[PDB]
Copies of this chain bind each other. A is one copy, B any other.
Amino acid sequence: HCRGMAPNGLPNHIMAPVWKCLHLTKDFREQKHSYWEFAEWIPLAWKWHLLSELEAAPYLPQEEKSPLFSVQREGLPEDGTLYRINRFSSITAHPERWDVSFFTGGPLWALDWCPVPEGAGASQYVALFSSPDMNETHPLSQLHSGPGLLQLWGLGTLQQESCPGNRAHFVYGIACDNGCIWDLKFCPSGAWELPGTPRKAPLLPRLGLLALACSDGKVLLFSLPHPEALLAQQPPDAVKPAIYKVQCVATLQVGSMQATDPSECGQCLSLAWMPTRPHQHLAAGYYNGMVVFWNLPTNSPLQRIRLSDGSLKLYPFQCFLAHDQAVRTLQWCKANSHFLVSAGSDRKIKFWDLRRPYEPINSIKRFLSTELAWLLPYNGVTVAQDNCYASYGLCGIHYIDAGYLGFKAYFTAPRKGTVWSLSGSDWLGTIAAGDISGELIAAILPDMALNPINVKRPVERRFPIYKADLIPYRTYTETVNHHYLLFQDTDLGSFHDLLRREPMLRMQEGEGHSQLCLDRLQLEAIHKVRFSPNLDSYGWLVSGGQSGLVRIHFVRGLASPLGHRMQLESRAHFNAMFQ
C-alpha cells in the first residue's frame, strides 16, 4: 500500500497504478513495437490524383458552418460569445488550457490518432470520418456504397511551447466511393518515417498506414504520405482543401479467388490490427457475426491478386463465426496476440484463443456493449454499453475480468445514457468515455490484479472532462436554428478538492437523477473518444460527435513528472539514433 496525497491532489494509492502503467507501456513497446514495417508500401504521388473543386464537391460533407456554440471553462470568467466556424476550419487553442474545437462538416463516426514512434517529437495528426448529412441514418442490414470522404487533420507537435495559439489544419482528404466508414485503425507501429527521409520524387515519406472499415463491407488500406511531400509535389496554385482520389494499397474483402457468390457478411463494422511486431494480421468484425483475418504480406495466389490498376485484392486466410449478431467491437490482446476479445449485439462478451476458434475461452453475457477497451496491463476488459437492457441507473461503464482472478465486474462509472465510445490510455491506465448525454468523463482504474470489491468508493476515481448542453436560442436545421451548444469544460489542471468542485456535483446530479432526452436530434451526443497512443502528447484526448465539432483536450493533471522525464529520455535516444 501507499499513503498520502499526490501533488495533483489525488490519493497516492489512486495515482500509483497510473504511474506504474508508464513503465509497463514503455517496456512493452520496446519489446513488441518496431520502427519500420511494410517497406514495400511507400506512397507514390502518381497514385494521388488531386480532384478539382468541381470534382471534389460531391464528396464534401454538406454542412458549411458549425452549429453555434460557446465554451465555458471552470474558474475562468464567462466569455459569453457564441462561436461558429466553417467546415474544415478551427478555433484557436485557448491560450492557457490549449483545448481546440474544429468543424468537420458532419456527424463524426470514426476517429483515430496517427501513431508516432515514442521520442520522435513529430507533428501529430488524426484521421476521421464525418457523415455527409446530419439527418442520414443507415440500416445495418444493407450495404451502402455511397460517396464519402476520409479527413486527415493536423494537430501540430503539441509541445508546451507550441500549444498556445495552436490550430488544427485540414491537411488533405481522400474521396471514398465505398460508403460511410465505421472504423479507423492505423497500423500501431512501424508505419511512420521521418518527413525528411530522402526519397526520389515519385516516392513520398510515409506518415502512416491506415485501414478503413467500409459499410460497403470491404476494408481499404491506405499508406499515407507526409503532407509537405504532397504539397511540394502538388502545383502551388491548387485549391487548398486538397481532396485526393487515391488508389488503395490493397482492398480487403471476404471471398475466394473464383467465388462470385456475394458474401453474407454484409457491412464491415469493426477493425483490429495485430497489436505486436510485425503487425502482419488485420482482423475485422462483420454484421453477419463473423470475425475475419487477412495476412497482409501474403504472396500466395490464393489470397493475393493484383488488380489491373496495380493495387492488390486480399482474401482472408481465416474466418470464424464469433457471434449470433453484428460484431460491434473488437479488441486484440496486446500482451499475447493469440487472444482476442469481441463483443456483439447479442450482448455477449467473448474471449477467444485464436489458435482454437471453435470455443471461446470465456463468454460473459452482459448489456448491449457498444465498445470495448483492453488496456495492456490488466487481464480484463472495459465495456461501454447501451442502456436499453440494464436496470434503470445500473447502466454505465464496467470493467470485466477475463476470469482467472474471478473478481466480480467492477462498476467503474454509472451512466444514464448509452456510452457511444470509450478508449483506454495505456500510458495513463485510464479510460475516457462519451455519452449520448454529451458528457465526456475519465475514470482511473484500480490496480486490477487486486480485488475491486475492496475499492471503498469508485466515485473518487472518476471526473468529468466536459459536458455539451443544448441551450434553446426532429431535423438538424430545426435544432440549430433554435439551439446552441454550451460546452462546459472542467479545469483539468489538477484534481484538488475534486468532489466539492462544481463539475463533479453537476456530474453526480447527472448520475441517477437525470433523464433521457428524446423528440430532438441528440445534437448533444458524443460518438468517438480517443486518448493519444503516442508518448509525445500522451496526455492529450480527442472526441467528437453529432455536432460535427471535434474537440482536443489536454488532461494536464495526469501528465506528471515520470512521463515528462520518460518523454525527455526517449527524446534524447531518438535524436541520438535518427538524424
Residues on B with C-beta less than 8 A from A320 are: none
Taking the complex as formed, is A62 at the interface, i.e. its CB lies under 8 A from any CB of chain B? no
- Of all chain B residues, the one with the shortest Cβ separation from A562 is B577
Q: Flag whether A36 is at the interface (Cβ < 8 A).
A: yes
State whether the Cβ of A337 lies closer than 8 Å to any Cβ in chain B. no
- With an 8 A cutoff between CB atoms, is A236 at the interface? no
**A572–B7 CB distance below 8 A:** no
A575 touching B2, Cβ below 8 Å: yes
**A contact residues, total (Cβ < 8 Å):** 32
Whether A40 sits at the interface, judged by CB under 8 Å, is: yes
Structural contact, A34 and B561, CB atoms closer than 8 A: yes
Query: What DSSP secondary structure best describes chain A's contact surface?
Result: helix
Partner of A573, one of B12, B35, B565, B568: B12
B34 near A576: Cβ-Cβ < 8 Å: no
Asked whether any CB of chain B lies closer than 8 Å to the CB of A564, the reply is: yes
Please tell me if the beta carbons of A36 and B561 are within 8 angstroms of each other in the complex.
Answer: yes
Q: Is the CB of B37 within 8 A of A568?
A: yes
Q: A7-B30, A30-B7, A577-B19 are contacts. A12–B565 as well, Cβ < 8 Å?
A: no
Q: Is A257 among interface residues, defined by CB-CB distance under 8 A?
A: no
The reply to whether B36 and A4 contact each other, CB–CB distance below 8 Å, is: no
Q: A5-B569, A30-B7 are in contact. Are A576 and B35 (CB under 8 A)?
A: no
Tell whether A140 is near chain B: CB-to-CB under 8 Å.
no
Task: Give the docked Cα–Cα distance between A30 and B564 (Å).
Answer: 13
| Chain A positions 10-25 with a Cβ under 8 Å from a chain B Cβ | 12-13, 15-16, 19
Partner of A568, one of B15, B16, B39: B39
- Chain B residues contacting A6 (CB-CB under 8 Å) are 573, 576
Given the known inter-chain contacts A12-B572, A577-B19, please indicate yes or no for A564 contacting B34, CB distance below 8 A.
yes
A483 located at the interface, meaning its Cβ lies under 8 Å from any Cβ of chain B in the complex: no
Residues of chain A in range 31-73 having any CB-CB distance to chain B below 8 Å:
34-37, 39-40
- Closest beta carbon of chain B to A385's beta carbon, Å: 33
Identify which of B15, B19, B572 contacts A2 (C-beta below 8 A). B572
B564–A16 CB distance below 8 A: no
In the complex, are the beta carbons of B16 and A576 less than 8 A apart? yes
Whole-angstrom distance between the Cβ of A409 and the nearest chain B Cβ: 28
Measured in the bound complex, the distance between the Cα atoms of B561 and A204 in whole Å is 21
B contact residues around A15 at 8 Å (CB):
576
A3, B571: Cα distance in complex, Å: 10
**Complex interface residues of chain A between 548 and 574 (CB less than 8 A to chain B):** 560-562, 564-565, 568-569, 571-573
- Contacts of A573 on B, CB cut-off 8 Å? 4-7, 12
Of B16, B39, B560, B561, the residue contacting A571 (CB under 8 A) is B39
Q: Which residues of B contact A2 (CB under 8 A)?
A: 572, 575-576
A565 touches B35 (CB 8 A): yes
23 pairs across A/B with beta carbons < 8 Å?
A2-B572, A2-B575, A2-B576, A4-B569, A4-B573, A4-B576, A5-B569, A6-B576, A7-B30, A7-B573, A12-B573, A12-B576, A13-B576, A16-B576, A35-B561, A35-B562, A35-B564, A36-B561, A36-B564, A36-B569, A39-B568, A39-B571, A562-B577
Other CB < 8 Å A-B pairs besides A4-B572, A16-B576, A36-B565, 4 of them? A13-B576, A36-B564, A36-B568, A36-B569
Nearest 8 A-B pairs (CB), nearest first?
Answer: A4-B572, A35-B561, A12-B576, A2-B576, A39-B572, A39-B568, A36-B565, A39-B569
